Amino acid sequence: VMKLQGVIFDLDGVITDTAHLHFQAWQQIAAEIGISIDAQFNESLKGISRDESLRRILQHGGKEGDFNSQERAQLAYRKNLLYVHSLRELTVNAVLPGIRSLLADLRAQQISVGLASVSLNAPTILAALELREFFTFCADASQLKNSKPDPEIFLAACAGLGVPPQACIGIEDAQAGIDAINASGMRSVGIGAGLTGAQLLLPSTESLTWPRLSAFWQNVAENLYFQ
Amino acid sequence: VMKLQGVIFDLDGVITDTAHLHFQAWQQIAAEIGISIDAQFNESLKGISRDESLRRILQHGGKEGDFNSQERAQLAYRKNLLYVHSLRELTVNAVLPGIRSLLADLRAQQISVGLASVSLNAPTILAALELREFFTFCADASQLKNSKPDPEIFLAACAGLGVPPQACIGIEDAQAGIDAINASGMRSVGIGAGLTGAQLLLPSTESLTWPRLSAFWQNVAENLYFQ
Ligand SMILES: [Cl-]
Ligand SMILES: [Cl-]
Ligand SMILES: [Cl-]
Ligand SMILES: [Cl-]
Ligand SMILES: [Mg+2]
Ligand SMILES: [Mg+2]
Ligand SMILES: [Mg+2]
Ligand SMILES: [Mg+2]
Ligand SMILES: [Mg+2]
């Protein structure tokens, strides 16, 4: 059996959820220019670029004509600033169920732990969650050329851990993330119903335990022709 | 470097294209009940169940009321019969470019070749294309419980070849197929722009050569920690 050398984690939707904080920042910037948006409006911002998100908010309040590209840039700066402050305010209680105990178990088993997050705010987030001590290496999102589903960020995490991708498990909650893990050569674990292409599919982070990951590893890593 | 033990092929969209033949069979059965459909109508049959495909044809001609479920079953039987006859009429020229030369090369290299097709007509098809002699094992689609993206059909092909999935390359043209290959533990090769999650993505079957597959294998199978 090939030895498991690393377990590499996506951040959003696996370690913690940042979606509500993104919306709350947009809602605050909107309110500061006299526009009311709600969680129902936030569906219109789901999977949308930063510039188009702001434009949709402006359209919603009939205010596209009141801001040029430079002034919109200033609104976007403030929105991001408020968002990052909210990340620094996260507590240990924002970690998803099962995650802290799994990280503790991996470290007790001397398994190296990687982070493959595309967020430039990842270190700020892990610090707030009080989880930095569990990670061996975190990929640098500021150096990323292609986001998921390109395997780059996962390949970067593996290289940082100093091991080949096939000696690692990757954990994701999104299809583009599963696709990126698969394309990199890593063994894929998905969190959430509906994901396809995962070698191990779990319904939530609570199902994510060391004994389960270890059993999964022993199953997929075995090769009669290496006995 | 782990030894490459098998290359496993999807049938439709990789070895040959059956889409036009499916449409031509539907068009003939439609004509036999006085209904004219064209290739433009065939978009409405794309990714549709057999029963709903027939119902849409009947609706198109205003004839839903003229056939009960048993009579529709008789129309479906004839459509399938015409379709299967057309498969038996396929010639060597229906094989996609690059495929026959690749199969010849794999066999010269003593690499076992598998088929992972969900079609019950696969053996009829390979016989017509004069390709049976290149295949070591073909998975039995009549025993299949879950179709792609479930990895079952690829796992069945690997088991039939007597080797673990990770010692095999799988080749697919569809996203559900790539997902199935990935979930099985096999190394994935995709044919067609737009596919995600493939370890090697090629634009067409013409790009699919032994030297390329071999270079791909040597790259992904290497592990410093096995030297
Ligand atoms: Cl992330
Ligand atoms: Cl998703
Ligand atoms: Cl097929
Ligand atoms: Cl597809
Ligand atoms: Mg995520
Ligand atoms: Mg704090
Ligand atoms: Mg296909
Ligand atoms: Mg013939
Ligand atoms: Mg894989």
UniProtKB/Swiss-Prot annotation, chains A, B:
Listed GO biological process terms: carbohydrate metabolic process; DNA damage response; DNA-mediated transformation; response to antibiotic
Entry-linked Gene3D superfamilies: HAD superfamily/HAD-like, Putative phosphatase, domain 2
Coiled coil: none
Pfam families: Hydrolase
Cofactor note as given: Binds 1 magnesium ion per subunit.
Misc remark: The catalysis proceeds via a phosphoenzyme formed by reaction of an active-site nucleophile with the cofactor glucose 1,6-diphosphate (G1,6-diP). The phosphorylated mutase binds either G1P or G6P and transfers the phosphoryl group to the C(6)OH or C(1)OH, respectively.
Protein name as catalogued: Beta-phosphoglucomutase
Record lineage: Bacteria, Pseudomonadati, Pseudomonadota, Gammaproteobacteria, Enterobacterales
Gene expressing this chain: ycjU
